[PDB]
Amino acid sequence: IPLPFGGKSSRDLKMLETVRTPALHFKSVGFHLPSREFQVPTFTIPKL
Amino acid sequence: ALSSASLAHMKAKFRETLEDTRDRMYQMDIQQELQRYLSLVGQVYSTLVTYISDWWTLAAKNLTDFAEQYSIQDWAKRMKALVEQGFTVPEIKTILGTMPAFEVSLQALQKATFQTPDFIVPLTDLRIPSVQINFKDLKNIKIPSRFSTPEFTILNTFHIPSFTIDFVEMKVKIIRTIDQMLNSELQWPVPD
């Protein structure tokens, strides 16, 4: 089966290497929210 | 206003707000954001045309194999030559300039090289320059700090020579307006 984008990985489709959550540093109330980094499952599209 | 306690306090608070706004304004730049967007768009173009080239290689191979199995490989060669050569679009004449000729072969699209038209913006004297722009390499293109714009007309009667658009200049002008608001204790902002 000639799959479209055959041999193209998830990142080859421009998927972000890492998804990092926003970080909040409200100083008036003394709040701090760290950024959380979660990877994306990896896969490859078979050429045939 | 400075001769009264309440309005003096109001002016002090207004100047504090102005200082905060001016400090925040220092943390903004149009050029960097535009360059980031240009880089992203160029990356998209590059990956897309890469897949286009991959698909074209696969399709040409499949066509050649099909013709070989069909013993019409000469006709397949003719068709591949047509695909990779197509034909050239002739220059198109218009009152607002001439559209440059361009090639429409599959490889012409794969190179993705495009001639910017010799065009005049309606209701203005702005003539957009014609030059070659690559979409794959658009990620390697940068946003100029400033650029000159062609001549302009207002109401089709009055004329305005070419004006320079600078990303720094507009931001600096707005920040200077904020500063003038800050320095309006006994002063009036310049008419400029």
Curated annotation (Swiss-Prot), chain A:
Please, which domain of life does this record's source organism belong to? Eukaryota
Put simply, this protein is called Apolipoprotein B-48
- Name of the gene this protein is made from: APOB
Of the intact sequence, the residues represented are 1298 to 1345 of 4563
From Swiss-Prot, chain B:
Subcellular location field? Cytoplasm; Secreted; Lipid droplet
- PTM comment: Palmitoylated; structural requirement for proper assembly of the hydrophobic core of the lipoprotein particle.
The glycosylation sites annotated in the UniProt record are: 62
In the record, what disease is this protein associated with? Hypobetalipoproteinemia, familial, 1: A disorder of lipid metabolism characterized by less than 5th percentile age- and sex-specific levels of low density lipoproteins, and dietary fat malabsorption. Clinical presentation may vary from no symptoms to severe gastrointestinal and neurological dysfunction similar to abetalipoproteinemia. Hypercholesterolemia, familial, 2: A form of hypercholesterolemia, a disorder of lipoprotein metabolism characterized by elevated serum low-density lipoprotein (LDL) cholesterol levels, which result in excess deposition of cholesterol in tissues and leads to xanthelasma, xanthomas, accelerated atherosclerosis and increased risk of premature coronary heart disease. FHCL2 inheritance is autosomal dominant.
Q: What is this protein called?
A: Apolipoprotein B-100
**Induction summary:** Up-regulated in response to enterovirus 71 (EV71) infection (at protein level).
Quaternary structure and interacting proteins, as annotated:
Interacts with PCSK9. Interacts with MTTP. Interacts with AUP1. Interacts with CIDEB.
Effect of mutating residue 66 to C: In a colorectal cancer sample; somatic mutation; confirmed at protein level
Q: Which organism is it from?
A: Homo sapiens (Human)
- Role played: Apolipoprotein B is a major protein constituent of chylomicrons (apo B-48), LDL (apo B-100) and VLDL (apo B-100). Apo B-100 functions as a recognition signal for the cellular binding and internalization of LDL particles by the apoB/E receptor.
In the complete protein, the residues contained here run 2499 to 2690 of 4563
